[PDB]
Amino acid sequence: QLRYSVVEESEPGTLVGNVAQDLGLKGTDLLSRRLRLGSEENGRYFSLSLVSGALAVSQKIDRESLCGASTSCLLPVQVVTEHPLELTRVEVEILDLNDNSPSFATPDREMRISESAAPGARFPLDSAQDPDVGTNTVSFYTLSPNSHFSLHVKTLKDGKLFPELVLEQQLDRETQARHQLVLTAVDGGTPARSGTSLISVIVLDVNDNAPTFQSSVLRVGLPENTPPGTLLLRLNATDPDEGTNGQLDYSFGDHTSETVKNLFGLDPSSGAIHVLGPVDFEESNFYEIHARARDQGQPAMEGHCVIQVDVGDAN
Numbered sequence: 001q002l003r004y005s006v007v008e009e010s011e012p013g014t015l016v017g018n019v020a021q022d023l024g025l026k027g028t029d030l031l032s033r034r035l036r037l038g039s040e041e042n043g044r045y046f047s048l049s050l051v052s053g054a055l056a057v058s059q060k061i062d063r064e065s066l067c068g069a070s071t072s073c074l075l076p077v078q079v080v081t082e083h084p085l086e087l088t089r090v091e092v093e094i095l096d097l098n099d100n101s102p103s104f105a106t107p108d109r110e111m112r113i114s115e116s117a118a119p120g121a122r123f124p125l126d127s128a129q130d131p132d133v134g135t136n137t138v139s140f141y142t143l144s145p146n147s148h149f150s151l152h153v154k155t156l157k158d159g160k161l162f163p164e165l166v167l168e169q170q171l172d173r174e175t176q177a178r179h180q181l182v183l184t185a186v187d188g189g190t191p192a193r194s195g196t197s198l199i200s201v202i203v204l205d206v207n208d209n210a211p212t213f214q215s216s217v218l219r220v221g222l223p224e225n226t227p228p229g230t231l232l233l234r235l236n237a238t239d240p241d242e243g244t245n246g247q248l249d250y251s252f253g254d255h256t257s258e259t260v261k262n263l264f265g266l267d268p269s270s271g272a273i274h275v276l277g278p279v280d281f282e283e284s285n286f287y288e289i290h291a292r293a294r295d296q297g298q299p300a301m302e303g304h305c306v307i308q309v310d311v312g313d314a315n
């Protein structure tokens with residue numbers, strides 16, 4: 001019947017539509033025919049003047065309150081005019097305004113990702129919300145430039161955007177334990193409104209590193225008269241991993257001969273190797289020990305060292 005429109009959040013007293021003019025009532029006709037609104041509920045947001053005959057906004061209207069996420073917001077009101085008693089249907093469309101900014105559940109987020117995460121891995125992200133309708137809702141996401149992660153936004157059945165991180169490079173806790181990203185949600189308004197979420201990616205430690213000796217090959221020389229308990233040398237292996245993954249225990253190689261095992265002995269903790277038995281040039285001029293540092297992780301890693309022992313002559 002009658003169709004008018006008014007912009008959301010417009011200040012009260014804002015003209016909506018000249019009902020009297022569109023109905024043919026002039027001056028006295030407004031009082032004589034008693035120009036009214038349907039009920040008390042009708043005049044909650046609107047007001048119809050007996051003087052001007054103009055329908056205007058009574059209370060500040062929020063489209064997010066009335067229609068929520070509906071595409072079209074139609075507010076029906078009845079205009080009653082007597083002599084003859086006739087009712088008129090008036091449909092006032094509340095035009096959406098871009099007054100809402102994209103919002104996140106939390107301003108800062110922490111994400112814990114395993115160091116062994118293979119590239120191509122996808123991690124979902126908390127989407128942003130924007131109660132506006134049409135293009136005035138969330139339009140796109142942007143991820144701050146970084147070296148390991150990428151942004152992938154997928155369109156859903158609801159028409160809602162679903163953002164997710166994509167791993168581009170192998171993470172390494174031993175270089176940087178933390179990454180910081182800025183996820184920005186932007187709507188499609190002019191000017192565009194936006195909201196941010198700060199993501200802190202914590203790289204969880206994985207036993208991906210094996211112990212390493214200070215020297216891959218070591219060569220020492222000891223006199224033939226060296227008594228038992230004499231300090232040959234102390235091993236120095238290091239592990240960059242965290243916790244039990246970074247602690248190690250020294251031991252001989254699996255293929256180590258019993259002669260060496262009886263001659264030398266190593267402390268699995270300090271890595272100090274001491275000579276237990278007697279040494280002579282007659283027996284053997286050269287001994288080659290295979291040192292091994294085993295990781296206290298899971299799975300266990302291990303590093304290998306080679307010690308070269310040269311024995312002096314008798315008499």
Ligand SMILES: *[C@@H]1O[C@H](CO[C@@H]2O[C@@H](C)[C@@H](O)[C@@H](O)[C@@H]2O)[C@@H](O)[C@H](O)[C@H]1NC(C)=O
Binds near residue numbers: 212213214237238
């Ligand atoms: C024990 O070794 C530490 C690490 O040295 C470094 O790591 C080893 C595995 C090799 O890659 C080597 O080239 C590096 O320099 C030393 O920082 C530390 O001083 C050493 N402790 C000693 C000598 O008492």
Ligand SMILES: *[C@H]1O[C@H](CO)[C@@H](O)[C@H](O)[C@@H]1O
Binds near residue numbers: 184186193194
């Ligand atoms: C989100 O984006 C809008 C438009 O790009 C900016 O105006 C705002 O400051 C925030 O960075």
Ligand SMILES: *[C@H]1O[C@H](CO)[C@@H](O)[C@H](O)[C@@H]1O
Binds near residue numbers: 108198
């Ligand atoms: C994105 O930027 C906003 C300011 O616009 C911060 O409040 C937020 O914590 C995030 O860093």
Ligand SMILES: [Ca+2]
Binds near residue numbers: 062063064
């Ligand atoms: Ca609003």
Ligand SMILES: [Ca+2]
Binds near residue numbers: 008098099133
């Ligand atoms: Ca709105």
Ligand SMILES: [Ca+2]
Binds near residue numbers: 101130137187
């Ligand atoms: Ca908006």
Ligand SMILES: [Ca+2]
Binds near residue numbers: 171172173174208
């Ligand atoms: Ca690593």
Ligand SMILES: [Ca+2]
Binds near residue numbers: 115206209240
């Ligand atoms: Ca590691």
Ligand SMILES: [Ca+2]
Binds near residue numbers: 241
């Ligand atoms: Ca390790």
